[PDB]
Design a protein around this ligand. Structure first.
Ligand SMILES: *[C@@H]1O[C@H](CO)[C@@H](O[C@@H]2O[C@H](CO)[C@@H](O)[C@H](O)[C@H]2NC(C)=O)[C@H](O)[C@H]1NC(C)=O
Ligand SMILES: *[C@@H]1O[C@H](CO)[C@@H](O[C@@H]2O[C@H](CO)[C@@H](O)[C@H](O)[C@H]2NC(C)=O)[C@H](O)[C@H]1NC(C)=O
Ligand SMILES: *[C@@H]1O[C@H](CO)[C@@H](O[C@@H]2O[C@H](CO)[C@@H](O)[C@H](O)[C@H]2NC(C)=O)[C@H](O)[C@H]1NC(C)=O
Ligand SMILES: *[C@@H]1O[C@H](CO)[C@@H](O[C@@H]2O[C@H](CO)[C@@H](O)[C@H](O)[C@H]2NC(C)=O)[C@H](O)[C@H]1NC(C)=O
Ligand SMILES: *[C@@H]1O[C@H](CO)[C@@H](O[C@@H]2O[C@H](CO)[C@@H](O)[C@H](O)[C@H]2NC(C)=O)[C@H](O)[C@H]1NC(C)=O
Ligand SMILES: *[C@@H]1O[C@H](CO)[C@@H](O[C@@H]2O[C@H](CO)[C@@H](O)[C@H](O)[C@H]2NC(C)=O)[C@H](O)[C@H]1NC(C)=O
Ligand code: EIC
Ligand code: EIC
Ligand code: NAG
Ligand code: NAG
Ligand code: NAG
Ligand code: NAG
Ligand code: NAG
Lengths: 299, 286, 50, 50
């Protein structure tokens, strides 16, 4: 503490230099069924970008190891969380968005990006937590005659708000003259058909994009990474992993009871004073292992 | 399918205020014995509130009070009824099937939420029949829209059973709802408190727990309130078939971005709130 | 005055100095160490200033 | 490696190559260089050596 070999006479309060926790415990809810990756990624058909499809995912085990042989991903980007930590985390509200876009429009699927897809088809919130996954789909989405099934909205009066979908087919009049349907000189049908071909360039080749949006620590999580649970340890300083929340603390039974919507409790300092065990609905108080207070009186 | 309603004495609605109503929990985090300052869309204290009430008493002056109200960055809905006359709400920019619309309705047993390009008619209502032979009610004439379309989102709850009359005088339900559309998510906060007030919005503090966060992903600028009417033995004909509504009242308020100080109870329930913008004393308290 | 000063210091921990979260545990749980260090450093500098 | 596995060769990246084949330290000092090798690494019958 003094950063000196020689010490004079003093009370000398000293900072702690000792190790306390040697036990690590993981508490995760009971989930047996694997996440439906095959339905989400390996699907015979995908929605058009303007009519993007949203699928709720719940009560699933998020193991991405299964997809390693089956699928190869051209683009994988996670904004809210680091990709390595996904296995140790639980996702409270995961939603999967599936659509097909041109190969060079994959860049547009990012927060703050601008372009035809970003402005009039799919919009991402600036504060986006989740991962965007894209892969080439030329074999399944392209035909020798050509695939014109996929559609995108070329013209719209205003830019789309984040996570907003419009399927309106109403004629757009660039000119002042009222359109009254009847596409004409200044009136154009808003949707434009894509033209995917097997021999077409990679930029024009079809790409399937899946966007995952989720919150992790906040809220009860029915979706969790593949970590085995361990027996609860209480009244000892232990490292704990409750629903992807990692901390070192003493665990004790808690008199305070959370409301059903509430999953965890935070004190004035904003640290997690109380937590609810995932498997059993018992509130557990979290207490710092160290209490402090040491001084060395030395001649 | 559905048809317009005739013979309604048309008088503009009354005006009220929300003394402390419209406070909801901001997050699911649990806080005990602490005062927390949060900024979110909130109903301002003593804000102007529009009172639409259905009185169909004999001697004339009968009314249905079913207009189209703009959705201004979220709305606060409070319903005081004993006959369950309020059935649900429809939210859409145009409501003519040109654009997708959100329908939330409790036909009689289970709430149904659907997002589809619906062709809503001028008078979107529900019907009940009072049989005098066997005193029973079948809740027929379901006529909110005329046509559906794509139906991108479907939500149906499990079947239940409900009383279709229960007219004893003073309203006893005081159901309160807060509607917010943000980032393609529709958020509903609901609080139910029993009341004995005969015909007025109660002056009290209520905290609305989060109910559901539907991912509708649609633009909403306007909303209407669906209502149920009962036709029995009076003036039949389907336009003025004696559709007397015994009594119901609903109040509409508009959410505004505001800074609120929320007090948390030892049990963690919000018990008091302060609106800083309301007055100088509140501003010093914040 | 002495009690108020200690109480305010405990309250200062709640504030986040440009960090994603004011909780060290949340940052460590959601971020790998190189990204986590930048957020932890912002909390460390602000707490030292307090 | 495959063309789209080039992204995996970065610090903090995850995937089959990062998890079980090649791992980069989070505090990595140095340069990663990648180029297409189809002419030398691909055969009409197919190259299964890698
Ligand atoms: C992993 O995927 C590879 C894809 O090439 C599989 O290898 C091929 O498997 C198919 C049948 O599924 C055979 O017709 C090919 O001849 C195989 N190719 C080679 C080079 O062996 C492999 O079987 C998969 N492995 C697992 C464990 O799933
Ligand atoms: C109820 O009356 C309204 C009038 O307010 C009718 O609305 C009209 O709908 C027709 C479509 O055929 C339009 O031509 C008119 O412009 C509308 N009028 C207005 C002022 O909106 C409605 O059709 C009537 N409903 C029924 C079923 O009779
Ligand atoms: C807000 O609304 C309340 C309730 O309608 C009003 O309070 C009423 O005031 C009148 C006139 O003084 C009394 O006769 C009623 O008995 C009161 N009712 C209740 C339940 O208090 C109030 O005047 C309105 N104005 C504001 C802004 O407070
Ligand atoms: C949400 O819908 C409203 C319609 O109620 C849109 O408001 C219109 O905006 C256009 C220009 O974009 C104006 O010319 C119109 O005057 C507006 N009103 C009406 C009644 O059409 C609004 O733009 C929509 N929001 C988004 C993001 O699409
Ligand atoms: C008698 O009680 C029953 C159940 O409440 C109802 O009788 C029905 O009457 C309708 C015609 O109004 C018939 O179509 C049904 O087949 C009858 N059902 C049964 C179970 O008999 C009716 O609500 C009551 N009132 C009458 C009309 O007697
Ligand atoms: C939503 O519904 C409409 C109405 O069918 C679909 O638009 C097309 O409508 C014409 C008739 O006017 C049909 O011949 C077409 O077949 C419909 N389109 C298709 C794909 O069949 C519209 O496509 C639907 N939108 C979505 C997103 O499903
Ligand atoms: C030649 C005229 C240039 C005038 C410069 C003044 C401002 C206009 C240019 C700034 C915006 C960049 C335009 C490129 C559009 C990229 C389309 C996309 O990425 O989706
Ligand atoms: C379809 C199930 C989605 C449910 C969401 C819950 C967790 C699953 C998503 C998070 C893991 C990221 C998956 C991306 C895999 C990257 C593949 C790679 O390049 O290595
Ligand atoms: C993907 O789907 C096809 C068709 O259902 C099926 O044959 C295949 O086994 C699935 N798995 C892969 C390889 O992704
Ligand atoms: C999970 O399993 C354990 C052990 O069987 C049990 O005690 C606990 O209540 C279960 N929790 C759930 C989520 O059912
Ligand atoms: C509420 O709105 C009405 C109509 O705009 C207005 O006359 C009244 O002054 C407002 N406030 C009160 C006091 O109700
Ligand atoms: C109410 O729910 C749906 C609304 O579409 C309706 O089809 C169904 O018949 C009704 N169920 C009951 C039991 O009232
Ligand atoms: C809090 O909970 C206790 C125990 O259930 C109860 O007695 C009390 O009425 C509740 N309300 C208060 C005073 O916080």
């Amino acid at each position: 503490t003094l950063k000196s070999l020689t010490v004079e006479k003093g009370i000398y309060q000293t900072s702690n230099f000792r190790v306390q926790p040697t036990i690590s415990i993981v508490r995760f809810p009971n989930i047996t069924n694997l996440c439906p990756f095959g339905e989400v990624f390996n699907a015979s058909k995908f929605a058009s970008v303007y009519a993007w499809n949203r699928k709720r995912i719940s009560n699933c085990v998020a193991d991405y190891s299964v997809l390693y042989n089956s699928t190869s991903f051209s683009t994988f980007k996670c904004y809210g969380v680091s990709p390595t930590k996904l296995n140790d985390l639980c996702f409270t509200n995961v939603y999967a968005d599936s659509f097909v876009v041109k190969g060079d429009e994959v860049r547009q699927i990012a927060p703050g990006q601008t372009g035809v897809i970003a402005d009039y088809n799919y919009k991402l919130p600036d504060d986006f937590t989740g991962c965007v996954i894209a892969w080439n789909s030329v074999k399944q989405d392209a035909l020798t005659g050509g695939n014109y099934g996929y559609l995108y909205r070329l013209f719209r009066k205003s830019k789309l708000k984040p996570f907003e979908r419009d399927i309106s087919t109403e004629i757009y009049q660039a000119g002042s003259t009222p359109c009254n349907g009847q596409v004409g000189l200044n009136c154009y049908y808003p949707l434009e058909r894509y033209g995917f071909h097997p021999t077409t360039g990679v930029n024009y080749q079809p790409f399937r994009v899946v966007v995952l949006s989720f919150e992790l620590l906040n809220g009860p999580a029915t979706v969790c990474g593949p970590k085995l649970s361990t027996t609860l340890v209480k009244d000892k300083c232990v490292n704990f992993n409750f629903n992807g929340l990692t901390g070192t603390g003493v665990l004790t039974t808690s008199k305070k009871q959370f409301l059903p919507f509430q999953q965890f409790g935070r004190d004035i300092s904003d640290t997690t004073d109380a937590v609810r065990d995932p498997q059993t609905l018992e509130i557990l108080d979290i207490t710092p292992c160290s209490f402090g207070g040491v001084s060395v009186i030395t001649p | 399918q559905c048809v317009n309603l005739t013979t309604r004495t048309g008088i503009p609605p009354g005006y009220t205020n929300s003394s402390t109503r419209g406070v909801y929990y901001p997050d699911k985090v649990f806080r005990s014995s602490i005062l927390h300052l949060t900024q979110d869309l909130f109903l301002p204290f003593f804000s102007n509130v529009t009172w639409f009430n259905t009185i169909n008493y004999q001697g004339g002056f009968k009314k249905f009070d079913n207009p189209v109200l703009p959705f201004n960055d979220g709305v606060y809905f409070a319903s005081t009824e004993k006959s369950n006359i309020i059935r649900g709400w429809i939210f859409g920019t145009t409501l003519d099937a040109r654009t997708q619309s959100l329908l939330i309705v409790n036909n009689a047993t289970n709430v149904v939420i659907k997002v589809c390009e619906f062709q809503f008619c001028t008078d979107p209502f529900l019907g009940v029949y009072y049989h005098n032979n066997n005193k029973t009610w079948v809740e027929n004439e379901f006529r909110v829209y005329s046509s559906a379309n794509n139906c991108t989102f479907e939500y149906i709850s499990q079947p239940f059973l409900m009383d279709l009359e229960g007219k004893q005088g003073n309203f006893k339900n005081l159901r309160e709802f807060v509607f917010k559309n943000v980032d393609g998510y529709f958020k509903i906060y609901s609080k139910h408190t029993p009341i004995d007030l005969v015909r007025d919005l109660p002056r009290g503090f209520a905290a609305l727990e989060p109910l559901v966060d539907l991912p509708i992903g649609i633009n909403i600028t306007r909303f209407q309130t669906l209502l149920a009417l009962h036709r029995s033995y009076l003036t039949p004909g389907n336009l003025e078939s004696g559709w007397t509504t015994g009594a119901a009242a609903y109040y509409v308020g508009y959410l505004q971005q505001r800074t609120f100080l929320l007090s948390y109870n030892q049990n963690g329930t919000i018990t008091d709130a302060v609106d800083c913008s309301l007055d100088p004393l509140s501003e010093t308290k914040c | 005055q002495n009690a108020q000063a200690l109480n305010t210091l405990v309250k200062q921990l709640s504030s986040n100095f440009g960090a994603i979260s004011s909780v060290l545990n949340d940052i460590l749980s959601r971020l790998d160490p190189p990204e986590a260090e930048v957020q932890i450093d912002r909390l460390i500098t602000g707490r030292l200033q307090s």
